[PDB]
Amino acid sequence: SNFLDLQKQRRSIYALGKTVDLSKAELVALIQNAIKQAPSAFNSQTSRALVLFGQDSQDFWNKIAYSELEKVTPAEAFAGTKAKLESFAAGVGTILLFEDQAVVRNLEENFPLYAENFQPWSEQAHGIALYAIWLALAEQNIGMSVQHYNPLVDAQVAEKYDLPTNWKMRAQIPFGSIEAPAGEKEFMADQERFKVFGDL
């Protein structure tokens, strides 16, 4: 098999469970290594990550995200939110990805000739880290989805885990065993997406 097979295997999984065959040490090393190997502009390595397990992971969703969402969600709609938060907490853990703003700013100040690009290149590096993790877990038959309850949960997350303010949260990832396969995904016409020129 090749990389294309793994790419096809990787999908967004919303039905997660706790039946994984890897330990904490193996899960931690898998995640961190996947992120460490993900490239970044000038090897700035602005990628930061928080990995939660057990009660911690579940509390992030059922307590942190929960308390914040009820302050902005309609009463007649909260029931559906609580259930959704539970589905994410039903997994093995949660990964929170951050981008170190102190490193991006240091770059802007020292190399203004590039400045404008540091912010976008930082967002690009985050995406790369996200895909790196997604691929690494998919190969191990571990499912996950990408969530964006930021910056709503930012405040509480930082205080609870003594996270520097410069660590700007960009995504929260619940992961676990795959309890239900994803459905049919759609693709756009390749003709209006790509263009080839030249021969070689």
Add this chain to the structure above:
Amino acid sequence: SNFLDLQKQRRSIYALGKTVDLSKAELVALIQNAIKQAPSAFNSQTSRALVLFGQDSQDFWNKIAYSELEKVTPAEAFAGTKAKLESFAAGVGTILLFEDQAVVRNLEENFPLYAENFQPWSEQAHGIALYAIWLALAEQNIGMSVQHYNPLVDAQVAEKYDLPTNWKMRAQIPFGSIEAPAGEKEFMADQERFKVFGDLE
């Protein structure tokens, strides 16, 4: 041979050659399929790409890039620029990655509540398409690098190929045969980069 092996094999190759044993059709498929499988915010699919071979690929660096860099690069320094441009054209081809702005705008306009997320999600989607290609090619022992001469060469590239005006260029990737391994790698202190809380049930 897990994913981590491939990740570690993927490096920024600056020494490229023209000795690739894959037909154009296979190269095109490799690149396009890798992009298609790369995810994007609610399957928005804002990634676009232009693959150039031969003269087209060579001209992008020696003509378009060159001409634009020359008009803004110091005389007593342009010498190095030309040398680099030729190292990129010494490969098999070039990949230009764009992000469809028309799609992103339609989202920011209809979703004034999430408007601020689309731009960063687009940049992130671009990075994902980039890494997807970089990995697909590394597995084929095909080297490449990511360059950023945008938006300096935006107008000429868009004109020469008459691309949709919404295709905002984000990167130019020269690929070819790996003529020499990458240097050494540097990693920051992990205890400064990560944090772990909790245990498995």
